Ligand binder design. Structure first.
Ligand SMILES: CCCCCCCCCCCCCCCCCC(=O)O[C@@H](COC(=O)CCCCCCCCCCCCCCC)COP(=O)(O)OC[C@H](O)CO
Ligand SMILES: CCCCCCCCCCC[C@H](O)CC(=O)SCCNC(=O)CCNC(=O)[C@H](O)C(C)(C)COP(=O)(O)O
Lengths: 12, 81, 71, 459, 122, 86, 128, 172, 127, 55, 55
């Protein structure tokens, strides 16, 4: 399967 | 696959070296309550493991086979010289 | 861990193998046994000791130049 | 000379007369522009100092510090426009006025050609910093903190005033060149020691040596971010500049009287770095680290060895840039957590990944990891000290060993480890904080390629 | 070998100390002894980049080994006879070493018993 | 490692209690409370959970080990400890 | 019965060999009954502010700020000069300083002695 | 709370066997020694003198504290084990994901929509679940850290958010 | 002796919400919806070339990925190093100091031609 | 030491990862037939470490 | 879940295996003879290199 991984926003 | 769990009619204690302790407990006066657990570790392909020195000389039979042809090749080559 | 692994696990059983891992096993295990005594055949002396170690006691005093007790 | 001064002071009318919201912009523009012009002054000739007039001159020692101060000036503006946004325009303008007025004095004293002229703005830097610590400081004990910082330096500076004017009445002028050329062997007469003590204690106080250092933890912690950087990155270093300049007429008295300070400094650095190993406050820990590095320079300057001066100037700058950065690290973390305890916000790396890096080279630079300029400083000083005496390496190297433990101690306690569950206000880092942090680290490694720029006149 | 026990467990006066020998004069005990005639002068042994501990009498059987190694490249199975010749030379050098060791060893016990023989008669 | 899902757990779970000779296979139920009906002494209950411990490879804290009491509840505590939801 | 385990400040006695709780009283058990109650009294409201949706901030621990205060400021106001404090201050103060002074003084008093009579070698020492 | 004697014996039984496993290593020895270790346990089960039972467990763990393997066997995931919070550095709290930039949030629309439901649910449930707390809180503060479930229908059990929304033990 | 029915129910819902939450932690077939990606002329040429799939394409695929990796990571760096060495570093004295090439008895040199003398005959040691 | 000592680690690492990241030497046994290549690799490495002649 | 069939593990281990099998033969035969070789060992202690490990 595939499930959402949580990660701090690296966009900034 | 669905990881078919084998039907539990094969991992008993007879033959598996645990039963030696089983009668020893019977000699003491107790019945071992978990022999069928360790049975898989002493049954199937997991049984009859090689001895210690048996591990180190693994491949000797082929290693010696490569030896005899090797000396034959060089002895003939030396003879031709 | 998707379906289709060639090493599909087992429960309380001997895991399945493949011919590839066996043939890669004994060959190096055999060729290690090839190499150890192959060099033994051709380089026996170094491990054996090659040149001998002489024993000092048997050597007389003439080569050692040890003059007799009188002088 | 003038090409730096008038641009600095003419910057003051700009901030006062600028638009309501453009103050940060135009001030930052020309503060960086002033830095560029100051870098043009970085050039030096072989042996004769770059002399401009009777009032101003620069040498291979003053120039690296000059470009450092001008380089600093944008950084406080960058570091301060977060806790001063909710303030009346006049107070913001006044805050900016304090910084550039402070920075203006720094250019003046470093370029001063006369010791008294060096002296007049030597304490004049105190008035703007006193305002910064007291008014805009964010704490309660800042009031007692400002008093401790103010009185300590004055208690040491006033003997210099009596000493300095005594030189004028005895040896004519106090022009730095005229002192150096007409230097005479200071005698061992029991007055000359008090002569020696007065000419030295003033620079001792604002270069915290063990015993005369309790103002610094109270100076740094309660001061606002901009106050902490300027105080730790340049202010602890006027004392340094004075010693290289004023020790010209303290020999050979420096040879014999150096002993009490050398023992106090060498033992003090082990003690102070030990305090760093068990500091509850992040800002205090960085502050005490400054004492250890600064105390190393005390031994460096007071040995009076060519190598010792060179490593001093290397640690002169490298510590200042590093200490300013670490204070930025603590500040950038503080407002998010609104506390100063180190263990309050653990495991920050998992939340802020880039700050994990910025904290990482920051800790490595303070580690004197080669080839960072800090290593060139410490390693040069160790060799000079070792030539002076073989034993000191036991003290010297022990400091590096202690310096390792506490430096990564803040790294593990804050950055690494498990994130704190209760806190939920940690937002992704503003790119201002990120930009500022690179503004600090990047010139440091850029300096690694050219140590000769900051080695000093002894080079 | 066993002389360690003979020195420490037994008396120490009858084992020639390795830091002391030779002590008796070489001519003493050796009438008309010959000198180790060296072969490769200091020049050739020098520019061969020969290391000091190898700058010995058997070094002559080491230098041409390098020459054989030079032409042997890339083959590393050559120089077998030359290397064996070199090792055999060090054997000849080595076999002399304990010969000198027992030369001093046998002499000093001989000196001891001779001394007792020439002292107890009085 | 393929996702270990609760159907596999109970299959492996009841595999071991059925293995336990003190609990012969016929009357194993998913919610068969041990000493209430199977008569398994609580002193052996602190023993069947280490059998579970090696079965799935992890430690069961004692605070809940004494509370791990029924084969379904055995499975239930297994699932959340390894976030088994499928 | 192999010899016992004697504890130490660095290797304390484990609770498995501690005689107190193995000899409980009809009072000590009562003592360890409100221990959990106050612990819950500290845990309950903590989770309340921890699980509060409106809560956007940091749950300051009064114990934490107490520790920082007691270790930063509440020392001198509670300090009293006594022979224990006085001697320890002198021992850890002037003590090491004067000790290092003597060590460095005699070392320098030997170094200049050697070079003054030419009893030391600095043939290749130039970059001092 | 009350660490009554029977739990202590179970503590003794469980941990000693684990140490015994670390000693015998081989399964047959471990099985054999466990039964005799078991046998010497249940044989003394008839003691109306609970103090004597305590006296029997004075020398008990003292022998264990002698007989303890200096390196007991621990599965790596447990405290002391090799894989202890090894994957902690990966797990990140869910609230940090609210910070995500809208473009990042747009990359996962439906899951973020599901988050909104959870955010909505936890909002009104908080007042409901907190209201259940005071109305049934025992006098003189909480006596036991155990938390009562949701008595009525529909409402969620109090203080459910962090336990339910706890990051999974294998985050990657 | 097993949870009390209330806390058994508490763990029941705690299980139930956790299952729903863990279920809600999944992805979707479309997820993640990444944006358009800038592409260059060369890569999709390789893509359509490799679409055939037979080993004829892939054998020269690895060699090309090895080709441009050799040029831009081995061939280029050694070029600038040689230029730096040959005309900057070696332009300064005592920067690249060799060892004297060890010469052996009987070995001639090419710079001045002559062969230095052979070794004098050994004392004939044989084993 | 660069060759055989470096070996023993990922040879051990092979058993670690394959047997569910377990590093306690008391949990293996019978791996000779289970991982013939890893077992083959280790015996050569151990023999090299012991100093078996000509290798 | 015992498995080593992954080529990455197989290739990496085998790469050093052929390295470790020969290893010293190449290096010792290739490097110039640049340490002094002792020749006359009394056989009793020349076997010690093998006696102690075999013991
Ligand atoms: C908080 C206390 C101070 C902190 C530490 C500061 C440094 C310690 C020493 C302070 C010295 C201050 C006075 C020095 C002024 C310049 C000294 C100088 O130039 O040297 C003169 C040294 O002469 C002095 O007498 C200087 C003062 C000596 C110290 C006594 C007074 C200062 C200490 C007490 C006042 C300050 C302490 C605080 C009091 C609340 C040379 O004159 P002379 O005596 O050689 O003149 C020729 C002839 O011999 C007759 O004059
Ligand atoms: C390798 C070996 C190392 C050394 C290892 C340890 C071996 C030596 C110690 C062995 C035990 C010791 O003799 C006596 C003791 O602590 S206790 C005796 C049984 N009596 C009780 O504990 C109280 C009444 N009984 C119950 O509480 C329950 O019966 C019980 C929980 C026991 C069973 O479970 P259920 O039934 O509740």
């Amino acid at each position: 399967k595939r499930l959402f991984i949580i990660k701090p926003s690296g966009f900034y | 696959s669905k990881m078919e769990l084998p039907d539990y009619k094969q991992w008993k204690i007879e033959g598996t070296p645990l039963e030696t302790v089983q009668e020893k407990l019977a000699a003491r006066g107790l019945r071992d309550p978990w022999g069928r657990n360790e049975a898989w570790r002493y049954s199937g392909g997991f049984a009859n493991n090689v001895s210690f020195v048996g591990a180190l000389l693994k491949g000797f039979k082929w290693g010696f086979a490569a030896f005899v042809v090797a000396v034959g090749a060089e002895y003939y080559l030396e003879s031709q010289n | 861990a998707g379906g289709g692994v060639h090493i599909e696990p087992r429960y309380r059983q001997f895991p399945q193998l493949t011919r590839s891992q066996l043939i890669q096993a004994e060959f190096f295990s055999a060729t290690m046994w090839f190499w150890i005594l192959w060099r033994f055949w051709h380089d026996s002396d170094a491990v054996l000791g090659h040149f001998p170690y002489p024993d000092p006691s048997q050597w007389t005093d003439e080569e050692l130049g040890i003059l007799p007790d009188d002088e | 000379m003038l090409k730096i001064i008038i641009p600095t002071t003419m910057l003051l009318p700009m901030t006062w007369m600028s638009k309501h919201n453009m103050i940060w912009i135009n001030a930052t523009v020309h503060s960086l522009l002033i830095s560029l012009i100051s870098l043009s002054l970085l050039n030096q000739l072989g042996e004769n100092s770059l002399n401009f007039s009777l009032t101003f001159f620069s040498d291979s020692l003053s120039a690296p510090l000059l470009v450092l101060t001008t380089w600093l000036l944008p950084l406080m503006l960058m570091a301060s426009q977060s806790h001063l946004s909710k303030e009346t325009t006049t107070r913001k303008k006044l805050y900016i006025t304090m910084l550039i007025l402070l920075q203006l004095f720094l250019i003046m004293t470093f370029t001063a050609t006369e010791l008294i002229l060096f002296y007049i703005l030597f304490e004049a830097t105190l008035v703007p910093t006193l305002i910064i610590i007291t008014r805009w400081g964010n704490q309660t004990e800042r009031l007692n903190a400002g008093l401790y910082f103010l009185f300590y330096t004055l208690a040491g500076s006033l003997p210099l005033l009596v000493a300095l004017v005594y030189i004028q009445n005895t040896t004519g002028s106090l022009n730095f060149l005229i002192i150096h050329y007409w230097s005479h062997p200071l005698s061992n007469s029991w007055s000359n020691i008090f002569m020696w003590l007065a000419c030295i204690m003033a620079f001792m106080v604002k270069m915290p040596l063990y015993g005369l250092h309790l103002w610094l933890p109270k100076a740094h912690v309660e001061a606002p971010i901009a106050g902490s950087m300027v105080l730790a990155a340049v202010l602890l270093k006027l004392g340094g500049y004075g010693m290289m300049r004023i020790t010209t007429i303290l020999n050979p008295l420096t040879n014999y009287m150096a002993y009490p300070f050398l023992m106090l400094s060498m033992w003090g650095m082990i003690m102070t770095s030990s305090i760093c190993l068990r500091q509850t406050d992040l800002k205090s820990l960085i502050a005490y680290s400054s004492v250890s590095h600064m105390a190393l320079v005390i031994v460096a300057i007071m040995i009076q060895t060519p190598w010792s001066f060179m490593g001093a100037t290397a640690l002169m700058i490298a510590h200042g840039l590093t200490s300013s950065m670490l204070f930025c690290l603590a500040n950038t973390n503080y407002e998010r957590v609104h506390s100063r305890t180190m263990i309050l916000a653990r495991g920050l790396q998992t939340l802020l990944p880039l700050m994990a890096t910025w904290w990482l080279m920051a800790s490595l630079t303070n580690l004197a990891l080669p080839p960072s300029i800090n290593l060139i400083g410490e390693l040069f000083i160790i060799t000079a000290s070792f030539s002076w005496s073989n034993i000191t390496i036991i003290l010297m190297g022990m400091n590096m060993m202690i310096t390792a433990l506490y430096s990564l101690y803040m790294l593990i306690t804050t950055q690494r480890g498990k994130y704190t569950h209760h806190i939920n206000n940690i937002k992704a880092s503003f790119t201002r904080e990120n930009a500022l942090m690179a503004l600090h680290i990047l010139p440091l490694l850029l300096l690694t390629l050219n140590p000769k720029m900051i080695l000093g006149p002894l080079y | 070998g066993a002389h360690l026990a003979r020195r420490y467990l037994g008396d120490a006066s009858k084992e020639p100390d390795p830091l002391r020998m030779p002590t008796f004069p070489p001519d003493y005990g050796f009438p008309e002894r010959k000198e180790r005639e060296m072969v490769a002068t200091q020049q050739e042994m020098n520019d061969a980049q020969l290391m000091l501990q190898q700058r010995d009498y058997c070094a002559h059987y080491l230098i041409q080994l390098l020459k054989c190694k030079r032409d042997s490249f890339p083959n590393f199975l050559a120089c077998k006879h030359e290397q064996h010749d070199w090792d055999y030379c060090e054997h000849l050098d080595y076999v002399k070493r304990m010969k000198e060791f027992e030369r001093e060893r046998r002499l000093l016990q001989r000196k001891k018993r001779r001394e007792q023989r020439e002292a107890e008669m009085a | 490692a393929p996702p270990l899902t609760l159907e596999a757990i109970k299959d492996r779970v009841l595999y071991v209690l059925k293995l336990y000779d003190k609990i012969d296979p016929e009357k194993l139920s998913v919610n068969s409370h041990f000493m209430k009906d199977l008569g398994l002494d609580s002193l052996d209950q602190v023993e069947i959970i280490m059998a579970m411990e090696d079965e799935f490879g992890f430690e069961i804290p004692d605070i809940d080990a004494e509370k791990l009491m029924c084969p379904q509840e055995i499975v239930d505590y297994i699932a959340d400890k390894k976030d088994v939801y499928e | 019965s192999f010899p016992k385990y004697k504890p130490s400040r660095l290797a304390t006695l484990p609770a498995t060999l501690d005689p107190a709780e193995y000899d409980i009283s009809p009072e000590t058990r009562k003592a360890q009954a409100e221990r959990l109650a106050i612990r819950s009294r500290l845990k309950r409201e903590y989770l309340l502010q921890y699980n509060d949706p409106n809560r956007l901030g940091v749950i300051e621990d009064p114990a934490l700020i107490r520790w920082t205060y007691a270790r930063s400021a509440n020392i001198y106001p509670n300090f009293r000069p006594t022979p224990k404090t006085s001697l320890l201050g002198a021992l850890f103060g002037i003590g090491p300083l004067f000790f290092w002074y003597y060590v460095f003084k005699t070392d320098r008093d030997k170094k200049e002695k050697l070079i003054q009579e030419g009893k030391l070698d600095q043939t290749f020492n130039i970059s001092y | 709370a009350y660490l009554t004697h029977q739990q202590k014996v179970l503590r003794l039984y469980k941990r000693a066997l684990r140490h015994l496993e670390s000693w015998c290593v081989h399964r047959d020895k471990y099985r054999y020694f466990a039964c005799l270790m078991r046998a010497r346990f249940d044989e003394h089960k008839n003691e109306k003198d609970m103090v004597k039972a305590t006296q029997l467990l004075r020398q008990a763990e003292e022998e264990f504290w002698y007989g303890q393997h200096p390196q007991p066997y621990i599965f790596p995931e447990s405290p002391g084990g090799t894989s202890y919070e090894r994957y902690e550095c990966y797990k990140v709290p869910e609230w940090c994901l609210d910070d995500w930039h809208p473009s990042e949030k747009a990359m996962y629309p439906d899951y973020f929509a599901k988050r909104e439901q959870w955010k909505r649910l936890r909002r009104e449930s908080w007042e409901r679940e907190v209201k259940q707390l005071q109305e049934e809180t025992p006098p003189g503060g909480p006596r036991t850290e155990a938390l009562p479930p949701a008595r009525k229908e529909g409402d969620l059990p109090p203080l459910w958010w962090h336990i339910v929304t706890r990051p999974r033990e294998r985050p990657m | 002796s097993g949870y009390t029915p209330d806390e058994k129910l508490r763990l029941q819902q705690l299980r139930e919400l956790r299952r729903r939450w863990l279920k809600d932690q999944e992805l979707s077939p479309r997820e993640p919806v990444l944006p358009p990606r800038r592409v260059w002329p060369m890569e999709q040429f390789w893509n359509k070339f490799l679409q055939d799939g037979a080993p004829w394409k892939n054998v020269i695929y690895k060699t090309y990925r090895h080709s441009i990796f050799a040029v831009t990571h081995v061939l280029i760096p050694v070029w600038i190093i040689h230029y730096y060495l040959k005309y900057h570093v070696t332009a300064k004295p005592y920067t690249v100091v060799e060892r004297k090439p060890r010469i052996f008895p009987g070995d001639t040199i090419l710079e001045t031609g002559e062969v230095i003398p052979l070794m004098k005959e050994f004392p004939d040691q044989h084993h | 030491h660069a060759f055989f000592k470096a070996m023993l680690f990922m040879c051990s690492g092979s058993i670690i990862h394959s047997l569910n990241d377990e590093q306690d030497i008391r949990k293996m046994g019978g791996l000779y037939k289970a991982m013939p290549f890893t077992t083959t690799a280790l015996i050569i490495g151990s023999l090299a470490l012991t100093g078996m002649p000509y290798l | 879940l015992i498995n080593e069939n992954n080529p990455l593990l197989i290739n990496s281990i085998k790469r050093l295996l052929i390295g470790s099998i020969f290893a010293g033969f190449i290096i010792s035969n290739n490097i110039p003879p640049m340490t002094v070789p002792n020749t006359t060992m009394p056989l009793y202690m020349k076997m010690t290199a093998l006696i102690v490990t075999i013991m």
